[PDB]
Amino acid sequence: ATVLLEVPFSARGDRIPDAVAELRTREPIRKVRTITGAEAWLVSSYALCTQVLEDRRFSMKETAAAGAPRLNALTVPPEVVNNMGNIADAGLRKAVMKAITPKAPGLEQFLRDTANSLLDNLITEGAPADLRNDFADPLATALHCKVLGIPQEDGPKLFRSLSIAFMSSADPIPAAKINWDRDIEYMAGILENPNITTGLMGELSRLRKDPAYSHVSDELFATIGVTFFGAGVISTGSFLTTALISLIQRPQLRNLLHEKPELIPAGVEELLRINLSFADGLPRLATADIQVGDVLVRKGELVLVLLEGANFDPEHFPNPGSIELDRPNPTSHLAFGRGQHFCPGSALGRRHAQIGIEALLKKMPGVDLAVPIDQLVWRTRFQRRIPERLPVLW
Ligand code: HEM
Ligand SMILES: COc1ccc(-c2n[nH]c(N)c2-c2cccc(-c3cccc(N)c3)c2)cc1
């Protein structure tokens, strides 16, 4: 006898398990067991993944309900699950969106300067360099301090919460609450700090004292700051890191993008499509009985939308494992989700990776792994797939 198929399949972010394609072909929605012991429906075809993400009866916010089957334990207060919904309800969506676009004056120049400085320091210190801890993550952290309008020197301490905050754990995590409460107190202080007048926290600080927002809670304002810094940093840092591995693994692509930098946006779009940075499917709770493929999903059941299921589906992306810069449907991947909860940071995330890669290829055109790829150490029971260190030479 055998037990029910368990998720996740593998913490390795450098290759997709052969199992995904077999599953997609034979059972593109099927029952699995999560690390909590709960049952869930795993959805792995492009067609069924988009169906679920485009049907609001598959609810994000209801995943936080007491007694629901769980993918993993909450690491935040249940209100945080619906942070974007609460932002919308408070009348803050347009202002938040505007604050996190990469189009702010001087932001792209800032990103370029920061990337080049990080890379110069690596070159000075001499190979091997760790491109995650000493390039991609610090670039993400610096970017988000700038976008939030908070001091650069505060970045590292906020960053160190994240190795716990974005755990994917069977059980509640005591350190997560300690760090969450501390970070909320920090952001509350930021809102009271008269020197904070730019970026997202600058704008929130202004709106907080505007009569049109006098009944928006200080808890929500602080929560937006902690949530957007943390989710933005973990998402951009982890994506850029695993995109760099994909690029290093492809010397011909690396050379083409070095030679023709104008192709980098199209390269980044394919790197997004093939990216394995999400460690778990996106969870949703059914709020009605809903037919998905051959399965009638029942009210109250957990559904997991497997992003690499959709994104490597050959029916939608022929030769899915290949980076092709001339696809006719290049942004139709699900790396930023789809529907009601489409990532509001998508433009910023694109620009972070484009500028990071452009700088790296200019400074280190000969970049290569300094260790056999199997020697990368993949973080386990985490919401992202990332190597603990990314040693390179050039
Ligand atoms: C390469 C970078 C990024 C990737 C791959 C990414 C990916 C995603 C995905 C897949 C979702 C949908 C989750 C779901 O439907 O369950 C999402 C939502 C979200 N993202 Fe991102 N993200 C990135 C960058 C950012 C940045 C830079 C920010 C903010 C500074 C951000 C903030 C958010 C927020 C607040 C949501 C929730 C939206 C909602 O519930 O309506 N993300 N992201
Ligand atoms: C800052 O630390 C956090 C840890 C977990 C969450 C969290 N727990 N459960 C849910 N639902 C969320 C959440 C809330 C808002 C946005 C995102 C999210 C999810 C995927 C990608 C990106 N960029 C953001 C996730 C939020 C913040």
Swiss-Prot record:
Keywords from the named record: Cytoplasm, Heme, Iron, Metal-binding, Monooxygenase, Oxidoreductase
Identify the cofactor(s): heme
Q: What is its main location?
A: cytoplasm
Which annotated residues bind heme?
A: 284, 341, 343
Membrane-spanning ranges: none
Cited PROSITE patterns: CYTOCHROME_P450
Where does the entry annotate site (Important for the position of heme)? 344
The record's disulfide annotation reads none
Q: Could you tell me what reaction this enzyme catalyses? A: cyclo(L-tyrosyl-L-tyrosyl) + 2 reduced [2Fe-2S]-[ferredoxin] + O2 + 2 H(+) = mycoclysin + 2 oxidized [2Fe-2S]-[ferredoxin] + 2 H2O
The protein's site described by Participates in a stacking interactions with the tyrosyl of cYY is found at 166, 180
E.C. code: 1.14.19.70
Q: What is the name of this protein?
A: Mycocyclosin synthase
Native organism is Mycobacterium tuberculosis (strain CDC 1551 / Oshkosh)
Organism placement in taxonomy: Bacteria, Bacillati, Actinomycetota, Actinomycetes, Mycobacteriales
Q: Which gene encodes it?
A: cyp121
